[PDB]
Design an enzyme around this catalytic site. Structure first.
Site, PDB file in Angstrom:
ATOM      1  N   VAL A 185     -12.398  70.762  98.866  1.00 39.89           N
ATOM      2  CA  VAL A 185     -13.763  70.998  99.315  1.00 39.89           C
ATOM      3  C   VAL A 185     -14.236  72.424  98.964  1.00 39.89           C
ATOM      4  CG1 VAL A 185     -15.236  71.139 101.379  1.00 39.89           C
ATOM      5  CG2 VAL A 185     -13.626  69.225 101.097  1.00 39.89           C
ATOM      6  N   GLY A 193      -8.861  65.225  97.780  1.00 40.94           N
ATOM      7  CA  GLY A 193      -9.514  66.267  96.999  1.00 40.94           C
ATOM      8  C   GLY A 193      -9.823  67.563  97.732  1.00 40.94           C
ATOM      9  N   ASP A 195      -9.932  59.743 113.726  1.00 40.15           N
ATOM     10  CA  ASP A 195      -9.400  61.099 113.507  1.00 40.15           C
ATOM     11  C   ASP A 195     -10.294  62.196 114.092  1.00 40.15           C
ATOM     12  OD1 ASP A 195      -7.365  62.867 112.563  1.00 40.15           O
ATOM     13  OD2 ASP A 195      -8.357  63.124 110.605  1.00 40.15           O
TER      14      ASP A 195
END
Ligand SMILES: CCNS(=O)(=O)N1CC[C@H](Nc2nc(N[C@@H](CC)[C@@H](C)O)nc3c2ncn3CC)C1
EC number: 2.7.11.22
Lengths: 298, 266
Positions: free
Chosen positions: A18, A16, A127
């Site tokens: 931001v 999605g 990550d």
């Protein structure tokens, strides 16, 4: 979802988009991660379910606060605290002037505290890169983007998919290790630490082999003595060129003796010898920031 | 704190965090008193069915135990549930679990497929949202099987042998079908099962629980352990496409329904 006014788009991911937003009534400035559900054939994306769940458990000042989850007509909104800038943007802005050593030190210690908390909750971030580390105006830094975070207990397996930007990927992963460990996150932080000091990526490779060769050029081509088991690994080749370790005065010149020490322990080839986040917090490099506690001998 | 001096974090700090999770995640052995139309044998048939579809799709034991905990905790938030609605709630709890735990989980159309047409993709996507929202998005619990894995790792760090693991898991799968297990914490349930195949000494060495902590649970567990003993424990199976080192982590299915009848009789 009517109480929020979109200020501007911050970024976009597979999952999605931001946005910076204002809760019009309160004046609370938040970060909204919008997730269109009508686009996904498998309902709420596996990755979104895991991030929401993990972030509810991980309550630590050096981790991004997830404030709310709102379900709208085929849309899922994650409401998070807003932070004005990431470490990548901050480091690029500071490329000429440099980052003051006390601020480098403060940021590294804070990152290590947030990471130790994740590791104690048996969670691997996987990550850690500068654009996933968010800072605020009053000296705080927080770990963010837990889209790829996986919990251990039954160790996390390795795969051929879009994982940690090659530049911050640990050498055991490049060399074909079948299981991730907490050492891969410490490797990323050592890369980030060196990058705060030099204001350039420590190992900016363009392929898995180029990344590995860049690591070997700086740290020296490893062997069975420095890393028990390296030669018996899936992607290791006896044909690898044998470079020697470079002096840390030529790799991170502005760093002191304590700094060079912590960085070598963070970039140790052996995942079993590589320092932990908890142990790193005790290192003499942060002796001016932290004051040791009495250990119960019992 | 039975964990040895951990390199990654404090041995006691990791252990205390695991214990504090059980204190936050709550389960109720009398949740069916909120759904009068339902009987405890209905939950047993549902979990047994989910266990079989897990074996069919070679799903992890953690995936099964996530779905069990999601189902049990969700129903504690609900009221007057009907017999027909149970198949959908269970398979949607399993859908969420597979997406969280598996790397390449089965697709939504395979989850609808195992319900012989009684559940469709849209019903499962609607139900997963109701489950996750009602559970307040707290979908990271420590399952009954996760504790068993921790206990095996501790006993062999001082990886582990697969055959012994599946024998204790087999007993916990039977105990899970009785809703009364939800009165004992998940860690207690696992230590008590391990005790039945070992001793109090080994149980205390790997779980840190004293005999008084697990005595109440071991008493309730006693009939189930006998049925497992009377028939003999199963052997480790091979699963196509499953790396042999992970074979003990694949969910299995037995004729546990009649074993559960004999257990409640004594
Ligand atoms: C990409 C632009 N970088 S920047 O220009 O330095 N800068 C502007 C504001 C931005 N703040 C936030 N950015 C992101 N970025 C996400 C990826 C786009 C990821 C790291 O969660 N997430 C945030 C932020 N505040 C809260 N959350 C949690 C959802 C940082």
């Amino acid at each position: 979802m009517e109480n929020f006014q979109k200020v501007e788009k911050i970024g976009e991911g597979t999952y999605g988009v931001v946005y910076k937003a204002r809760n019009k009534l309160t004046g609370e400035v938040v970060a909204l991660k919008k997730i269109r559900l009508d686009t996904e054939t498998e309902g709420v994306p596996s990755t979104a379910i895991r991030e929401i769940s993990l972030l509810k458990e991980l309550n630590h000042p050096n981790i991004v606060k997830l404030l709310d989850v709102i379900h709208t007509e085929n849309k899922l909104y994650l409401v998070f605290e807003f932070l004005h800038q990431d470490l990548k943007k901050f480091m690029d802005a500071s490329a000429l002037t440099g980052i003051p050593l006390p601020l480098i030190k403060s940021y590294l210690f804070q990152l290590l505290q947030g990471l130790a908390f994740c590791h104690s909750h048996r969670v691997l971030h996987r990550d850690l890169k500068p654009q996933n580390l968010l800072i605020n105006t009053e000296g705080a830094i927080k770990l963010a983007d837990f889209g790829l975070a996986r919990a251990f207990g039954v160790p996390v397996r390795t795969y051929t998919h879009e994982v940690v930007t090659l530049w911050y990927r640990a050498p055991e992963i490049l060399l074909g290790c079948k299981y991730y460990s907490t050492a891969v996150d410490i490797w990323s932080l050592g890369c980030i630490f060196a990058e705060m000091v030099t204001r350039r990526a420590l190992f900016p490779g363009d392929s898995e082999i180029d990344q590995l060769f860049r690591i070997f050029r700086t740290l020296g081509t490893p062997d069975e003595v420095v890393w028990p088991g390296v030669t018996s690994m899936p992607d290791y080749k006896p044909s690898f060129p044998k470079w020697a370790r470079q002096d840390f005065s030529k790799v991170v010149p502005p760093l002191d003796e304590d700094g060079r020490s912590l960085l070598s322990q963070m970039l140790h080839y052996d995942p079993n010898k590589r320092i932990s986040a908890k142990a790193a917090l005790a290192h003499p490099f942060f002796q001016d920031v932290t004051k040791p506690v009495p250990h119960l001998r019992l | 704190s039975p964990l040895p001096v951990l390199s990654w974090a404090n041995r006691e700090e990791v252990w205390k965090i695991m214990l504090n999770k059980e204190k936050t995640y709550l389960r109720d052995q009398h949740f069916l008193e909120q759904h009068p139309l339902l009987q405890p044998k209905m939950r047993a048939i549902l979990l047994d069915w989910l266990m079989e579809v897990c074996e069919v799709y070679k799903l992890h034991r953690e995936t099964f135990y996530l779905a069990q905990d999601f189902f049990d905790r969700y129903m504690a938030t609900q009221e007057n549930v009907v017999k027909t609605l149970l198949q959908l709630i269970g398979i949607s709890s399993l859908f969420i679990a597979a997406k969280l735990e598996e790397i390449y989980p089965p697709k939504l159309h395979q989850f609808a497929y195992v319900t012989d047409g009684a559940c469709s993709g849209d019903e499962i996507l609607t139900m997963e949202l109701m489950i996750m929202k009602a559970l307040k998005w707290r979908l990271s619990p420590l399952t009954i099987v996760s504790w068993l894995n921790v206990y095996m790792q501790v006993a062999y760090l001082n990886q582990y042998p697969q055959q012994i693991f599946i024998q204790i898991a087999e007993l916990l799968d039977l105990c899970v079908l009785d809703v009364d297990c939800l009165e004992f914490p998940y860690g207690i349930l696992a230590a008590s099962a391990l005790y039945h195949f070992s001793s109090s000494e080994l149980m205390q060495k790997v779980s840190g629980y004293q005999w008084c902590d697990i005595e109440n649970c071991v008493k309730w567990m006693v009939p189930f352990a006998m049925v497992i003993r009377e028939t003999g424990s199963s052997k480790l199976k091979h699963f196509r496409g499953v790396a042999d080192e992970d074979a003990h982590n694949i969910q299995t299915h037995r004729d546990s329904l009649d074993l559960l009848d004999k257990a409640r009789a004594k």
